[PDB]
C-alpha cells in the first residue's frame, strides 16, 4: 500500500505518527519502509519495533480482558469476539514475522542488527504462544525459544553485558521462561545472572550509557522481586 511513497517520507511520517500516538499508521509506514528492500538503521529499527509493540500491545491487553470474561462465563458472543481480536493479533504477528523473514534477518550481518531482529522474532512468536491452544502451540513455543537462543548466543559473544539490546533480550527471554515455558527457575537464573554481570560492567560506561543500562537493569530487578 505504501509502494508509491518515498522511503524517507515513510520514515518521516512514522515519526509524526509516533508523536500523534497513531501507532497503527506508524506500523504501516515502517512496513512500507522495510518493503523498500534496504537495510534499516539503528534508529529505523527502533521505529519499527516501537510501532508494532504498541499495536500488538493493545491487542494483547484487549485479548486478556475478553479471555477473562470468557473464562468466568464458562451465548457465543464473548467467544466470537475474543476470536476476532485473537485473529487480528495473529495477523499482526504474522506480518512482523514475515518482514523479519523477508528479508530483514538474512541481510543483518552486524551483531546489533541481527540480535535486534532475532529478539523481535522471539517476541512475536511469544505473543502467538500466549493465545495458542491447538496442535501447533509446542512448535510456536519452540520457534520463540530458538529465536531467543540464537540472539543470546550472538549477544554473549559480540556485545558487552551492559548493552541495552543484550539486556532487553535477556529480560524478554526470562519472561518467556516464566510465562510461556513454565520454567520459573530458568527465568530467575537468567535475570539474576544478567543483572549481576551488568552491575560489574557499569564502571566502563559514560553517564548516558550508564543511564540506558541501569534503566533496563531495573526491569530485571522488578521481575526478580515479583518472582522471589
Amino acid at each position: 500500500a505504501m509502494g508509491s511513497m518515498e522511503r524517507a517520507s515513510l520514515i518521516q511520517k512514522a515519526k509524526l505518527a509516533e508523536q500523534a500516538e497513531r501507532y497503527e499508521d506508524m506500523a504501516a509506514f515502517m512496513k512500507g519502509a522495510v518493503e523498500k528492500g534496504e537495510e534499516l538503521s539503528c534508529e529505523e529499527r527502533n521505529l519499527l519495533s516501537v510501532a508494532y509493540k504498541n499495536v500488538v500491545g493493545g491487542q494483547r491487553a484487549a485479548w486478556r480482558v475478553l479471555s477473562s470474561i470468557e473464562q468466568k462465563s464458562n451465548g457465543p458472543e464473548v467467544r466470537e469476539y475474543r476470536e476476532k481480536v485473537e485473529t487480528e493479533l495473529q495477523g499482526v504477528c504474522d506480518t512482523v514475522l514475515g518482514l523479519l523473514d523477508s528479508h530483514l534477518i538474512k541481510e543483518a550481518g552486524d551483531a546489533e542488527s541481527r540480535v535486534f531482529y532475532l529478539k523481535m522474532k522471539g517476541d512475536y512468536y511469544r505473543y502467538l504462544a500466549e493465545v495458542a491452544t491447538g496442535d501447533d502451540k509446542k512448535r510456536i513455543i519452540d520457534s520463540a525459544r530458538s529465536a531467543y537462543q540464537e540472539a543470546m548466543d550472538i549477544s554473549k559473544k559480540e556485545m558487552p553485558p551492559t548493552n541495552p539490546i543484550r539486556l532487553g533480550l535477556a529480560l524478554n527471554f526470562s519472561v518467556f521462561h516464566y510465562e510461556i515455558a513454565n520454567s520459573p527457575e530458568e527465568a530467575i537464573s537468567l535475570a539474576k545472572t544478567t543483572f549481576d554481570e551488568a552491575m560489574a560492567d557499569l564502571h566502563t560506561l559514560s553517564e548516558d550509557s550508564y543511564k540506558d543500562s541501569t534503566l533496563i537493569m531495573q526491569l530485571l530487578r522488578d521481575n526478580l522481586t515479583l518472582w522471589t
Binding site: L171, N172, E179
Partner: peptide
C-alpha cells in the same frame, strides 16, 4: 504479569 522491555 512481569515486565518485558518497554521504551
Amino acid at each position: 504479569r512481569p515486565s518485558s522491555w518497554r521504551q
